[PDB]
Amino acid sequence: GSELETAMETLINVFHAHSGKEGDKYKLSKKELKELLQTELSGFLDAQKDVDAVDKVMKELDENGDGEVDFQEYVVLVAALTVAMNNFFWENS
Amino acid sequence: GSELETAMETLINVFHAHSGKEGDKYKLSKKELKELLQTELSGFLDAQKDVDAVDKVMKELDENGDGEVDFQEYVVLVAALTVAMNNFFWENS
């Protein structure tokens, strides 16, 4: 697998790293996820703390706050935050 | 410099690489995405070419063929395959 595939596995491993914490073969719940998202995206989190996008994503995850959050749901949360800030990196470069 | 941050940025680098190819300052045209997704996730794809999920995952992005597909669209697409493929990792293991 390519770097992305490795990266995605890395995401999976992290996702799994949390699934174990909550107690699922493969799932993430809104409990580890909040901590996980801040934990992993410490850099992104800190950079756009006051940025609306984080709330919107946070809220969007809150919408997806019914119970469990899956890998696809997990990646978009980090991705959205990643792009949100990164988009500023593109625009503000 | 978290793994996720690195991993997500790695996705960005690839996304940026393709966005440069597609031409947008930051978007991905479906021109690249099929080539990119199959190419970059060759191992993931190879692991699950015949898997139905890839068809649907591949196609379901047609809806995101409205104009283009970007990092937010891109990450889910690879992640979707990743979860589909990695599902085998968890279950078959």
Swiss-Prot record, chains A, B:
Ranges for domain EF-hand: 12-47, 49-84
PTM field: Glutathionylated; glutathionylation increases affinity to calcium about 10-fold.
UniProt: Ca(2+) 1 binding residues: K27, E32
Keywords tagged on the record: Calcium, Cytoplasm, Glutathionylation, Metal-binding, Mitochondrion, Repeat, S-nitrosylation, Sarcoplasmic reticulum
Gene3D superfamilies: EF-hand
Annotated GO MF terms: ATPase binding; calcium ion binding; calcium-dependent protein binding; identical protein binding; protein homodimerization activity; S100 protein binding
PANTHER family: PROTEIN S100-A1-RELATED, S100 CALCIUM-BINDING PROTEIN
Protein name according to UniProt: Protein S100-A1
